[PDB]
Symmetry: D2
Subunit: 140 residues, 4 copies
């Protein structure tokens, strides 16, 4: 349901059961240099004070940047996992959607790096995340 890249015939955990399926992350565009995703804000994404949870912006950035890397590297026999996620918070989001745009800025042999912007429905920049993704040969 998430439109994550189809790079394998089966996956260990079905979309609807994962963190991402639970909060409702959906990938829209996906290219080697750029990917977008969004999510409808519901309480499941919020913390008790009624704001989108800082963790939700982190998770959306993490999935989008990792999977954008997976889309390219899996068929090359590689695995891609987050090694560093630095998200900074500029404006709270209370409702509507959060919309993430990941732009690739470095693609090394061992590390890819993506800048992710997280905007609210008015287009305001509410958070950014710098994602460093480790790329390593798959163990099996």
């Amino acid at each position: 349901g998430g439109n994550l890249p189809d790079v394998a015939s089966h996956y260990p955990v079905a979309y609807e059961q994962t963190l991402d399926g639970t909060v409702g992350f959906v990938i829209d565009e996906m290219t080697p240099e750029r990917a977008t995703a969004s999510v409808e804000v519901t309480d499941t994404l919020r913390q008790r004070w009624g704001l989108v949870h800082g963790g939700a912006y982190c998770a959306l950035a993490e999935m989008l940047a990792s999977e954008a890397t997976v889309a390219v590297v899996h068929e090359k026999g590689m695995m891609a996992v987050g090694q560093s996620n630095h998200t900074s918070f500029f404006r709270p989001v209370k409702e509507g959607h959060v919309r993430a745009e990941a732009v690739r800025i470095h693609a090394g042999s061992t590390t890819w790096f993506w800048d992710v912007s997280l905007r609210d429905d008015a287009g305001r920049l509410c958070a950014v995340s710098s994602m460093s993704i480790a790329v390593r040969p798959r163990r099996d």
Copy 2:
């Protein structure tokens, strides 16, 4: 609830409906300088490859560091929100628990900083998060 600090009579979102209650975060210890929390790994905490989601370590650190700041500052008329969350991933977790310990290292008039360590059931350091928490006068 998740045992979050009881600082107000009403909260906008019930624990069990927040991202925190959905994934199952529970605070164990809380003092002004040090707090701990933990979560059972379930699929809701995982991504589709079967590992604990990077976002889940970030969210655990974010709630713990923030709420451990709230516990001190709420009664002083202040709000505390995540301003920066830098989480780095050293070893994946596939199953069991993730346990977090937040140690406060700076308590400034406008910013508190917490180092958070995230450990598996074997005690191994799987991730760390450097949490910066903004502390502002509460709005009407």
Copy 3:
């Protein structure tokens, strides 16, 4: 001098004696939303293995982001200081120049955020720095 913003009649340390003047940082462009600076690589910018010091990219980003904030806020009675500097290193520099471009992405009442790109003489992205700048009322 290094062409830093001229906002005060006296400064505690002369350009040529600061770390900035010692290594040779010079600001080229400065507007409220965007600033650029550059430095010639000399041994003073290098570490003992002959590469540009990681600290040198961090210092270039720090001075540029801070002073580009000073340029706006000093006349408003505010001081601006680095609060967080996250620099990530993609490709080393052995000789030539390092050129920095800071693009402002958030200008909040208490925090400004700048994305800084650090490029070699070939235009290649060698490092980036996410600069968070605290903005406070100036003390007597």
Copy 4:
């Protein structure tokens, strides 16, 4: 003059000519899990406003964490370079010394991670740096 680990018979750049020798960084203790260094504050370490430059704390952290890794890995045929440096600034330093303690918290096959604390002469925690060091086989 810096007491950096002696792991090779010659180096590309002599200590006194490097950034580190110019500002005066000196390593005191050095073990596989922990290293310390300090530097006397002089104008060469300060910015124009008379404070220690944020870049100086970054550079001290960077050299100490990289070289602490070099001390162990060079004789194993590896190179160690900074891949990420995230320094956060809690209190300015105006004079005296800055004293850095690097503690190793993860030693992977490709990445080592060090927490560095930077204290003033009164022992106050003025800055911290999270250093991720890439370890790679040497090319020659």
